[PDB]
Design a protein around this ligand. Structure first.
Ligand code: BU0
Ligand code: BU0
Lengths: 496, 496
């Protein structure tokens, strides 16, 4: 099965209203920049962002010019002529709209609250999709909380029902309408809905893990924002998942959620695989096409794992644009975020940066010795290890944020497509390194084991192993006289 | 309120069928031994044991001679003339009848399954109580498993209704018919039903904690079988309660069930008090009137905390009676258990035993240097700390197993009555020692705490404390934008 390659296309309302394909000063990345070659390297384009209005329906930003917006979407759907597998999705949400303190957060909470509101919202999604020519629905709520999860899920089920009907009605069996979400890529936000991952994923074609922004100005110590594996010299974090409303025992929580742990991409993938009902083929690994910049770092380790003096406020509170060489940061008035395209021209422009590599996290980073700057980002070389990981773990594919941040040649997108599909690329000997792996074990990734069948009437000692009702169980203490699952003495440790 | 003093009277079927008050070789402890003075020192006598037959009704052992059994009961109920507060209870169950592999275990499991079976069993309990002149019903099932608890509880509720009605019908408002159980006194067996303690205790007058047999031949290391507080030099155990179906988070389970922990009487009491809905006044501390003997111990600490060569099979598999001086062990064909009366005479006979004292556990023990023997037991001085504990923790009183194991002067029973009621006994200065206390915290023992009210729209750092909806909550990590109780980030740490 061909791996998914899901690239976000984000364009602000202002850029839609003044859309042009001939002037980077108003629209830096028009649809024209997506050539036929790039469209063939993509499987999905997530147009972003749409929102949920106060009428609890999916809708565009009220300031959007509908005619210009329809034209941009048409420019995107025209790309399907170059790739009959391409889907133009649209995304509802994003951090700005849907975060706890975001402008529209209440609309997300209310839209999923009742059967009537969910049916009304679900219909609005399909309607938006058919009216504008999209190929599926992507929900990016960051993030539903525990009491909202069940309503959120019933909404996803309802959208799945109407999409499947719309697929049959439209004869789209060859390219069915799809439903996806962007999921959390770190344990803290994941813990909000972690216990109900199976029911969340069941109606989805993919869950796109936002396995980036694992470091940023909101953290006291600088770090890699999308490390694949852990670095023992780097910071560790409290495993919030051991506090999720799972209803598991102490042993189960401990074996599944070691704490502290390394906040890595591999961690977020394994934590999804630990739950029953979450198939690997539905997991998509997100990767960033941008870097995160810190100032005020110390020396001695290339800027890694150092305290810093980067403002953490949103938006950027000053007009001090201290990322040398990033005049795209001047345009956006924020020196903390730089696209891969900008970072490339910073490296080749003699600005004082060194490209260093951490062979444990398998990610690059830039260090500025003179002004004390640190940048964490990804490139075509980090994508080689992540692509092999995707294949080894039988994941659904890759997602990235976002297209407009690739270089003008599109090397990041091409690298991803190459690593999955190029007949002349062979990563069988690529060294995945000795960085720390996430070693938790849960109900969904229990190892295959063999054990004698349980015998009623037997008294088992501590550590005895038996097979029962499909699993291998182990006693946590001695003198066990009841059956596995009947008694808290038995721990599930193996499968089949 | 007078503290309860509940003494079990156990007499096997063969002793009932051949009952005599003139021959200790046939009946070692006839009812005659309980004088009016001793009768005034008791509040309850639990006659034991009755059983549940295959008709799912309460009944005597089929081999019992009914006329002789009535004679034994009448000798107990006649004692009520010397103490107008005394109740002669009868107990259903015990280890031999009700343990998982016991002869009648299925009858207990099946009796509580349905409304019809529970009603039939409950009525049989009242019918036995009135027919033989008992004053209440005591259930000693060792122990109901997790799936049986709800049915067990509905059975206890149903007995409560018929007892309350029977009290009205008989004009016994002055001495109402009572309902009790013996509960587990150690975490392993307690974990079977721990989560449902409140609903179990709700219909009861008392739950009698079997806070003994916390050491025995089934343990590899010798230890005190009823230590009041923990000895750091002694063995520690896996805290099974952290594996019970409580639905708590990792932090809550860890806060409530530190592990490993000292298996003590204080542990079992505090673990009951940690649960909401379990009033201290209903908790009764059991104490043993017998000792447990081990052979093959090493020296250096009086036989404490040593490996041993004691058989653990039941019954005792040989005729090797290695407990010097214990003639009663020869009669009973088991050198591992000795009544306090017998242990006293062993100390009086120059058999090689020394009485030592552990001032951490507040319990005595015997050590035999010559043959390497160790005995854990209780006496009148250990009862001084346990009686003071009962008063300090506002428990309902004391229970003991069993009357027939006291000496003929009744010093153990007289000691308990003295420490609770004698005007000339003063334990106000008794030093409870520095033994380890059980420090767990749960919902029934959350401390009162004060914190500023939670503020919607605020971002909290890690460790912040707020008051909300009746509790004080603490953040387990930073950047918290959700309400307490709404999210896995908040930990209940105090009550408002
Ligand atoms: C999609 C991706 N990421 C966000 O959209 C975003 C993610 C976080 C975040 O994980 N996060 C985690 C923990 C605490 C705060 C916080 N805040 C976030 N802010 C808001 C923000 C805050 C401070 C500084 C900059 C931005 C955000 N916009 C992105 C978007 C645009 C450009 C590049 C990348
Ligand atoms: C009421 C008290 N206690 C028992 O009646 C008893 C309690 C256990 C027990 O807690 N326990 C806990 C864990 C594992 C096994 C086990 N077994 C028990 N056996 C049976 C037994 C088995 C092996 C060796 C000796 C005795 C027992 N009779 C008693 C009764 C009469 C005379 C003295 C004391």
């Amino acid at each position: 099965t061909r791996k998914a390659v899901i690239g976000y296309y984000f364009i602000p309302t202002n850029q839609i209203n003044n859309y042009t394909e001939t002037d980077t000063s108003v629209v830096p990345f028009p649809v024209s920049n997506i050539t036929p070659a790039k469209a063939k390297q993509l499987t999905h384009i997530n147009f972003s962002f749409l929102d949920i209005n106060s009428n609890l329906e999916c809708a565009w930003d009220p300031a959007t010019n509908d005619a210009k917006a329809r034209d941009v979407v048409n420019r995107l759907t025209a790309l399907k002529a170059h790739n009959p597998s391409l889907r133009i999705m649209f995304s509802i949400g994003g951090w700005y709209y849907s975060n706890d303190l975001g402008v529209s957060h209440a609309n997300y909470v209310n839209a999923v609250k009742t059967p009537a509101s969910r049916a009304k919202f679900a219909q609005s999604c399909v309607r938006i999709m058919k009216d504008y020519g999209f190929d599926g629905v992507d929900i990016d709520w960051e993030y539903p909380q525990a009491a909202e999860v069940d309503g959120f899920i019933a909404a996803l089920q309802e959208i799945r029902t109407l999409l499947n009907q719309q697929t049959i009605t439209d004869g789209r069996q060859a390219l069915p309408y799809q439903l996806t979400i962007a999921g959390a890529g770190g344990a803290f936000f994941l813990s909000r809905y972690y216990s109900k991952l199976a029911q969340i994923v069941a109606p989805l074609d993919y869950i796109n893990l936002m396995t980036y922004d694992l470091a940023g100005p909101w953290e006291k110590v600088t770090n890699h924002q999308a490390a694949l594996f852990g670095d023992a010299a780097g910071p560790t974090f409290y495993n919030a998942l051991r506090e999720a409303n799972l209803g598991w025992s102490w042993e189960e929580l401990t074996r599944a959620f070691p704490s502290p742990f390394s906040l890595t991409v591999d961690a977020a993938v394994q934590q999804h695989l630990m739950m029953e009902g979450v198939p690997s083929a539905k997991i998509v690994m997100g990767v960033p096409f941008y870097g995160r910049a810190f100032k005020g770092v110390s020396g001695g380790n290339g800027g890694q794992y150092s305290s810093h003096s980067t403002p953490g406020e949103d938006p950027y509170p000053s007009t001090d644009y201290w990322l040398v060489g990033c005049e795209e940061c001047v345009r956006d008035k924020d020196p903390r975020i730089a696209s891969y395209r900008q970072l490339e021209q910073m490296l080749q422009g003699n600005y004082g940066y060194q490209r260093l590599w951490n062979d444990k996290t398998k990610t690059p980073y830039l260090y500025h010795a003179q002004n004390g700057l640190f940048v964490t980002y990804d490139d075509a070389e980090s994508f080689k290890y992540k692509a092999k990981y995707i294949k080894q773990q039988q994941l659904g594919g890759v997602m990235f944020w976002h297209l407009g941040q690739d270089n003008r040649n599109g090397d990041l997108l091409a690298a991803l497509d190459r690593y999955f599909n190029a007949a002349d690329y062979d990563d069988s000997q690529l060294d995945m390194g000795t960085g720390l792996r996430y070693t938790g074990v849960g109900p969904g990734n229990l190892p295959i084991m063999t054990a004698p069948a349980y015998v009623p009437g037997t008294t088992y000692a501590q550590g005895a192993l038996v097979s029962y009702q499909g699993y291998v169980w182990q006693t946590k203490w001695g003198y066990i006289t009841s059956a596995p699952g009947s008694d808290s003495a038995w721990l599930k440790v193996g499968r089949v």
